Each structure stands twice: as C-alpha cells, then as structure tokens.
Design a protein around this ligand. Sequence first.
Ligand SMILES: *[C@@H]1O[C@H](CO)[C@@H](O[C@@H]2O[C@H](CO)[C@@H](O)[C@H](O)[C@H]2NC(C)=O)[C@H](O)[C@H]1NC(C)=O
Ligand SMILES: *[C@@H]1O[C@H](CO)[C@@H](O[C@@H]2O[C@H](CO)[C@@H](O)[C@H](O)[C@H]2NC(C)=O)[C@H](O)[C@H]1NC(C)=O
Ligand SMILES: *[C@@H]1O[C@H](CO)[C@@H](O[C@@H]2O[C@H](CO)[C@@H](O)[C@H](O)[C@H]2NC(C)=O)[C@H](O)[C@H]1NC(C)=O
Lengths: 49, 44, 93
Amino acid sequence: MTMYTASLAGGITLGALGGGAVAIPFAVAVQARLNYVALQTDVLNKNQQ
Amino acid sequence: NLDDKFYLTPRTMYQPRVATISDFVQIEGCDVLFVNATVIELPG
Amino acid sequence: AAPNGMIFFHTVLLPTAYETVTAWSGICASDGDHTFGLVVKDVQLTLFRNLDDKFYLTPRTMYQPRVATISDFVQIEGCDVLFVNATVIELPG
Ligand SMILES: *[C@@H]1O[C@H](CO)[C@@H](O[C@@H]2O[C@H](CO)[C@@H](O)[C@H](O)[C@H]2NC(C)=O)[C@H](O)[C@H]1NC(C)=O
Ligand SMILES: *[C@@H]1O[C@H](CO)[C@@H](O[C@@H]2O[C@H](CO)[C@@H](O)[C@H](O)[C@H]2NC(C)=O)[C@H](O)[C@H]1NC(C)=O
Ligand SMILES: *[C@@H]1O[C@H](CO)[C@@H](O[C@@H]2O[C@H](CO)[C@@H](O)[C@H](O)[C@H]2NC(C)=O)[C@H](O)[C@H]1NC(C)=O
C-alpha cells in the first residue's frame, strides 16, 4: 500500500512513459489542472504563490 | 464589457475571453430576453 | 446470466507502443508590432508540429493527428515563456 501511494504521488510529475525518469515541475501540473477546471486567460498575472 | 465588446466566461472561474463568430449558432427566431444588435456590433 | 447474478465481459484497448512528439502550450504570434497569444480551446488536445512546420492537434487517448485550424484557438493578450514564437505567416490557416 505504501509503495502504491508513493507511485501514485510520483506519477503526477512524470513527463513521459516510454523511457527514463524525466520529470516536470509540480507547478506545471498544477497549471494543467487549473486549465482543466477553466481555460486560463491571464498568462502574465499568474498567482500560484 | 465597457467598450461594448462581447466576452465569454466559464461559470466555475472568472476567466473572460473575447468572443468569436465560431462560438455561436444561428437560429431563425429571437427571444424576448435577447440583446438587440446590428451587423456592425456582432463579434468579428 | 450467471447463478444468482451476471457476468460482464469488458473489452478495452491495450497499447503496445508510444509516439513521441514535441508539444507546445500555446503560440506567441507577432503580427507586426501586435504581439498576442493563441491557446488551444479544447484542453484535451495536444498541439505539435510536423516536419513541414504545420501545426497539428491530437487527442491524448489515441494518436489521431489532425490539421489545426483557426477555430480551434482562443486569442489572449499575454504570452507565456513556454510558447512557440511565430508570425502571421506561420499561423494556421
Ligand atoms: C429589441 O427589439 C425588439 C423588436 O423590435 C423589441 O421588442 C418589442 O418590444 C416592444 C416593447 O415591449 C413591444 O411593444 C413590441 O411588440 C416588441 N416587438 C417584437 C417584434 O417583439 C425589444 O423591446 C427590443 N429590446 C430592447 C430595446 O431592449
Ligand atoms: C506500430 O506498429 C507498426 C506496424 O508494425 C509499426 O510500423 C513499422 O515501423 C517500422 C519501423 O519504422 C517499419 O520498418 C515498418 O515498415 C512499419 N510497418 C508498417 C506496417 O508500416 C510502427 O512503428 C509501430 N509504432 C511504434 C513502434 O511506435
Ligand atoms: C520568443 O520570443 C521571446 C520574446 O522576444 C523571447 O523571450 C526573450 O528571451 C530572452 C532569452 O532568454 C530574454 O533575455 C528576454 O528577456 C525575453 N524577452 C521577453 C520579452 O520575454 C523568447 O526567448 C523567444 N523564444 C525562442 C526564441 O525560442
């Protein structure tokens, strides 16, 4: 169970599946989730802080 | 908006965006609660 | 039907290979002195470029590339750092 949860957590930042462990920033994943919720139209004034 | 330009926003989050002609469907009739406009005022 | 119930046969797609593409989160278009951005209207689609520098869109469930048109994009004022730079000529028809 702990390995399962760790793998679930680590899969969020995995950029590709066919090769090595290439990662993306967590903020990029958060921005993708935000775009899924609603299409963001203010690119300059990002306030993820 | 203030400049009489039509905008579209989702209801989950306020993310206004400019409206284009491809976002609309044309129908014959009109409703009472529709905003009146001419060809010039229509979105580009 | 089954004793005191039922059985379901679910048929699913099993992938055996992956296509690698270079994807962009948007296009920063510079028409003269007017710089604006174009983002994909459907968040379920991935935008990439072919060998002939033509923009294509594909779903992430299955690799089904299709040519991108202007009606698939939303115009915004600002640009992001991770956007591909382009001019009016390079924009989709
Ligand atoms: C938009 O234009 C329509 C059509 O002219 C207007 O509807 C008229 O409203 C008046 C006032 O209530 C009625 O007496 C007429 O019978 C209506 N005409 C039709 C054809 O339905 C409407 O009021 C206008 N909306 C505005 C100006 O906000
Ligand atoms: C999906 O399978 C097809 C069919 O086997 C693969 O296409 C082959 O690709 C190799 C390598 O370039 C060529 O030598 C063969 O001629 C192709 N076969 C056919 C029938 O076109 C394809 O590469 C696979 N997709 C992958 C591995 O991503
Ligand atoms: C796309 O064009 C923009 C705007 O000119 C480039 O952003 C500049 O990048 C340089 C190098 O990192 C910075 O010093 C500038 O400050 C940036 N300018 C602005 C206005 O942000 C961007 O690098 C270009 N992308 C390419 C060529 O791939």
